[PDB]
Design a protein around this ligand. Sequence first.
Ligand SMILES: COCCOCCOCCOc1ccc(C(C)(C)CC(C)(C)C)cc1
Lengths: 51, 319, 48, 54, 56, 486, 54, 65, 62
Amino acid sequence: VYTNWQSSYTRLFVSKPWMWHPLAWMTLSVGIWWKFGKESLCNERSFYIHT
Amino acid sequence: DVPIEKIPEHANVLLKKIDACLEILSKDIGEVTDAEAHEMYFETSKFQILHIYTGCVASFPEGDVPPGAVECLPGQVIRTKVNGEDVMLEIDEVDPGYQVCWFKPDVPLPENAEILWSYPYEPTAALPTGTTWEEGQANVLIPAEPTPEAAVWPPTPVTNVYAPMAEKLALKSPPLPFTPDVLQLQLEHNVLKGELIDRLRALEYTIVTEQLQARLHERRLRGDVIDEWEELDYHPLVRDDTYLAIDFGDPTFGRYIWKLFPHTDGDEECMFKDTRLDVLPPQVNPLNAILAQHTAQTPVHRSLEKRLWTEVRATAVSE
Amino acid sequence: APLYPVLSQASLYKRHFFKNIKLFHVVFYVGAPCVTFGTAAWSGSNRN
Amino acid sequence: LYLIVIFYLGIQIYVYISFSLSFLHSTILLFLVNYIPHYNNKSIFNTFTNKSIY
Amino acid sequence: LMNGLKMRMFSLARQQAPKIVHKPVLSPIPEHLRLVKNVAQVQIDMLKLLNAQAAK
Amino acid sequence: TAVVKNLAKLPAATSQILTNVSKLQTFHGLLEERRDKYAPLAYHTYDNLKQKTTWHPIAHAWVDEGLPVSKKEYNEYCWLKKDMQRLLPLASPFVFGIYGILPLAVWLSNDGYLPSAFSSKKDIVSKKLEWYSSYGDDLRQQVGPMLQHRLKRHLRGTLNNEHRLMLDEVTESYKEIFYSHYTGQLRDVRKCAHLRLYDGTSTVLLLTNKEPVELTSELLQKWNAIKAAKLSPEEEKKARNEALIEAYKEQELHGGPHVKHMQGYGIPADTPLLGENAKGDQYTQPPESASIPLEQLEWTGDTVFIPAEYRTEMEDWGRELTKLANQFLLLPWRFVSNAWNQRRLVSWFEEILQEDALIAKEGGVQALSDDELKVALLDRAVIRCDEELTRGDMEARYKEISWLMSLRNPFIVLAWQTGYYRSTYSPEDDLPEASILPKLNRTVLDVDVHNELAPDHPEKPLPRVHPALYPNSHLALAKEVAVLAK
Amino acid sequence: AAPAEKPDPALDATKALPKALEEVEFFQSYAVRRKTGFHLFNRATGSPTIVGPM
Amino acid sequence: VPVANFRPKKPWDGPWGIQISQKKDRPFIAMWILFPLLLVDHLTREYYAYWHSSKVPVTDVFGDF
Amino acid sequence: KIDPYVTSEVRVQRGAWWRSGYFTKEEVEMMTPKGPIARYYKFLLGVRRFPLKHGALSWACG
Ligand SMILES: COCCOCCOCCOc1ccc(C(C)(C)CC(C)(C)C)cc1
């Protein structure tokens, strides 16, 4: 008997917002780092603040 | 193409099948007794296990313990050999004003002591003999295990009015006291015949799931271990609905049972019971509610007319 | 006549060793070496 | 110290979870309160349609 | 049970095969089929009697 | 493989594709010419949140009773519309480039992805049956059970809240409709109609020059009688308005229409006068139509259907249930709002209703062939090709779903349909054993549609009474008797 | 709005403290000890310590 | 004639139940291999900077340097 | 998009439109949209076109 549980991960992901939640979480965290933490900490011009 | 006399043959076939199923499913696996499965019940006791094969165990009043005696308090586990049987004795509820201790032969017993059981002197022996609890030395209780009444399904009654008439025919050999309406009887017969065949097909459909569950139980009775999902495949109709419930992703349960079967509402242990007999389908004929509404709407002269319609039909068949 | 790839008794006997773990069987058994040789006691003391 | 630590941190985690959910209720989920009473149907076996009139 | 003592005795022996207990299984299928049998016998007696009347 | 086999006929298929497009254009011209003068204006309506359109068959699915068309020609029309839908991958090279030919190869691989022109068969019925038995029944047999579960879990709800959402009177009917694959017993369609008890009462407000009036069986009967009498319009309109004012008085005595006291709907009272505009005790300002005398009550020709589907409405279904309903019916479902899939489902519904009308014009179900009836039931999604039923069972199935679709509710339709797609597989080879009883046979007489059935009480189900056992059944079943004996 | 839900006993709190006390009683059951080999240095007053007997 | 609502298995019926069990116990098996690997990753580790360190371990991810 | 019966579904009860005389003719007129798209569509009522069922094709054609 057909189930996306055992036959399609894509339709399972589409049919469950609680599967979208971790992906949105990941995207938002990476966007936060890109906007705020990237240039202020990780760039070579801004890496001496770690001292 | 299916006469009505051929039905009870089919019923006998399906009875044989479901009996072959139930004689297997009537069997069940009891509690396991392998000590290797329960060794950790004794490993985890509040006291270390006493491997007792020498000396004696004695009951004596509470107070000072004789020096050298090993106290045997409630919760104490004792590996011994009793009448050739390797056993574990767990102390439970020693009486008040009394205590129990293992006295090796080196240890002298106190006054007012009662030897509950003793061991023989066998120092050269490699495999000790243990004890011999005589009749009256120890009262061992086997559980009664009273097998309750076998759960019987209620048989519904069936009034066969025509068997007395067949007997009357055999006596005489009119036979009847009334004028049967052959059309209405062939009507009920043709309708009822299909309802019986359609019922047998539903029972054969259900027997398939019983002779599947029984084929698996044959393996379970041989001692074979069946996976949780391997066992579900032998319940295919439930396997499908269970797999779809997994696809939806709602692992909750309990209120669905309480709505579909309201006799279980408030019963937390509904799954661990069999209340199908407390709730059976009623034997009410809904046709009575229909015919009553039919007479209430019609007048009386139409009721008397129907006696004319029937009588004229008899004369029409006569001529 | 099972139509599925029937699994031997010994294979189930071996898989039961892996799936019959309880939570404490992991927690304490892995926490003892971890707490002893971890950032608290030994590795931490050494490396700090 | 083990008991103290675990009791305190379990209390704090319970506080975090329970208060987070109570505030989820009081802040975000009261928007979605839509109670519909049950109205009995009568025209089950027959439905008026465009063809009934036109 | 002993004088001044109560105990629980457990055996120590490997269980080579499972222990069977006859717990009869309740099912409605046999009574379904017996009801079918009875109704069919009613109709069969009915048909035999009606044939005897119509022919005799 | 099938790729080269279909490339071999791709040159021979373009001519047939264009011919089919021309046929579709001609038929649509005829149908729209009739629709633009005989059909009413079904206005567009937005959902409760007022962002996307919502669709219902009562307003949007119109049936041209009097369409001078053969049933096979309408089958051709619908099948060629579906072929136009299937021709969409031809646009992939014209939007992606020359490298947009691998989608075209995937299209040409499976024959089920393709339109009619790539088929060797000629008759529309044989072509449709080939497509079904090759691709469509298999595609449908893997959506049925999951759709059934979604419908169930739409009624009973999520997270153990059945005591708050389900009804205790639809319980046994729910069980018989959704869990009869456990028992193996047949189902009564009326027990699926009982699922409408989850909803409210469906009403129809006729809009007049004064007030809206609720339609009733009595008013509709009178209007049908006036329509049958074939009177002059000076008399027709007079009698219609007489019945209308009678019904207006009747509902005013009842306590107004049902809609005034239903959550989500309502009729406003007279408007209020604010502050100094209040003239003493007269705090209200009645409308203009209050000046009109009640004897001049005339029907505006405008109607308002209110299904009152509080639990069944397609809006609350969701992103997933709509897609699965369109999958199960072999309709397009991907990458669209639920409004567009709602329209697609309603269009399928309209097609099936028009086909039912044309079948009834052509002499019922018995006039059809065996393959034609099989294909009709496949379109209705009540048969799978791995059954091999009898003719009587097929006729009863058609009658069942035709009556169920006459009620204009997709939810109960899908609940009925999904019950015929719950098939299991055994793990053993010997089991299931070969049966001893004959194949299942039925007749049109065994289907009870002409009688009402009250919902059986919870855990007190009643046996099924055949229609023939009812009084005066030989008089009620005389039409079916005449159709079958002939 | 006015649903009239009966009380659910599963939402009550009449088992948590009993269960915790059952766990603590199972813990303390393993403190039962025999008289032989018993010694515990009490305080200078003669009163027992806290950590000693546990 | 066969019994109704029964059919042979198909590819879209998914794997059997025993296969799903074999899928389930793979994390439980990898647990025994990964927890020792976790302990080894922690125990066989060395710090990356000291007060005397003139250099720090660098890892060019894409070889741009 | 023209008829204020449909452009008022967010704010106004549908019963206010079923009650004849609740809204007057001038009142219904001021509620109609006046923009150039509304006027284009008003002109387009009497224009021949090629209607389709409301869905993905009517949208793709724009
Ligand atoms: C998971 O929950 C279990 C946690 O329970 C921990 C309980 O810890 C307290 C146990 O410590 C004691 C306290 C007192 C005692 C004995 C000293 C009861 C008193 C006695 C033996 C003198 C009667 C023994 C152990």
